[PDB]
From a paper:
Galectins are multi-purpose effectors acting via interactions with distinct counterreceptors based on protein-glycan/protein recognition. We report here the first crystallographic information on the N-terminal extension of the carbohydrate recognition domain of rat galectin-5, which is precisely described as an N-tailed proto-type-like galectin. The overall fold in ligand-free and -loaded rGal-5 is composed of two antiparallel β-sheets (F1 to F5 and S1 to S6 strands) that form the characteristic β-sandwich structure. The presented data shows that the N-terminal extension can adopt an ordered structure and shapes the hypothesis that a ligand-induced shift in the equilibrium between flexible and ordered conformers potentially acts as a molecular switch, enabling new contacts in this region.
The rGal-5–lactose complex crystals belong to space group P22121, with only two molecules present in the asymmetric unit, and diffract to a 1.9 Å resolution. The two CRDs present in the asymmetric unit, which have bound lactose (Lac), exhibit very similar features to ligand-free rGal-5, with an RMSD value of only 0.3 Å for all Cα atoms. One of the two monomers in the asymmetric unit exhibits strong electron density for the first 10 residues so that their structure could be modelled. Intriguingly, these residues run parallel to the edge of the β-sandwich instead of forming the F0 strand and the protuberant loop observed in the ligand-free state. Intramolecular (hydrogen bonds between Ser2 and Ser3 with Ser39) and intermolecular contacts with symmetry-related molecules (hydrogen bond between Thr6 and Asp40) stabilize this special spatial arrangement. The carbohydrate-binding site in the concave face of the β-sheet is constituted by β-strands S4 to S6. The amino acids of the signature sequence, i.e., His57, Asn59, Arg61, Asn70, Glu80 and Arg82, directly interact with lactose through hydrogen bonding interactions. Additionally, Arg43, Gln45 and Glu64 form water-mediated hydrogen bonds with the ligand. As commonly found in galectin–lactose complexes, the indole ring of Trp77 stacks to the β-face of the pyranose ring of galactose. rGal-5 interact with Lac with a dissociation constant of 136 ± 16 μM, which is lowered in the case of LacNAc to 30.5 ± 1.9 μM and 5.5 ± 0.6 μM for the blood-group B tetrasaccharide.
Numbering used by the authors: 2 to 145
The structure:
């Protein structure tokens, strides 16, 4: 019961880009809320610094997976895929993703359940200053 043809909220169409004020720093929180499309294949949340993706968070409904990675100078590193339980996103279902930036890693929770910790690979946190949300979701709220 959610499809890409539904009218987005003002300024919340996808792909969505917004600034992270002051860039990342230890204790900085980001919250992204929305609904996965009923026919979703994948979507991604990217914390970007210049031409690189410091943190790529990629729920995949075709693979029943949540892929995490970093892209540096247009190349991908090794993927992290471990999950504590089942696939925390579902087609047609609302989600709230909380990303916590600590000094050494990201902590990521979905609907209040921790799903992964991701060690910082790009450590210049204040340059990680752009958030992108793209793919098969409708967005309802973003706080950075
Ligand atoms: O790792 C993030 C990127 O993965 C790309 O696909 C990978 C794939 O997951 C992996 O199994 C292997 O085959 O290499 C592919 C190319 O890196 C996605 O295409 C890309 O969008 C990112 O999600
Ligand atoms: Na799509």
């Amino acid at each position: 019961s959610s499809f890409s043809t539904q009218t987005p909220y003002p300024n919340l169409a996808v792909p969505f880009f917004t600034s992270i004020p002051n860039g990342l720093y230890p204790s900085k929180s980001i919250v992204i809320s929305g609904v996965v499309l009923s026919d979703a294949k994948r979507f991604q949340i990217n914390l970007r610094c210049g031409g690189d993706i410091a943190f790529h968070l990629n729920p995949r409904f075709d693979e029943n997976a949540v892929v995490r990675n970093t892209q540096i100078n247009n190349s991908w590193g090794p993927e992290e895929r471990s999950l504590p339980g089942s696939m925390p996103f579902s087609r047609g279902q609302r989600f709230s993703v909380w990303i916590l930036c600590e000094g050494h890693c990201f902590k990521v929770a979905v609907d209040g359940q921790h799903i992964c910790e991701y060690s910082h690979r790009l450590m210049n946190l204040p340059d990680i200053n752009t958030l992108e949300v793209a793919g098969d979701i409708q967005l309802t709220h973003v706080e950075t």
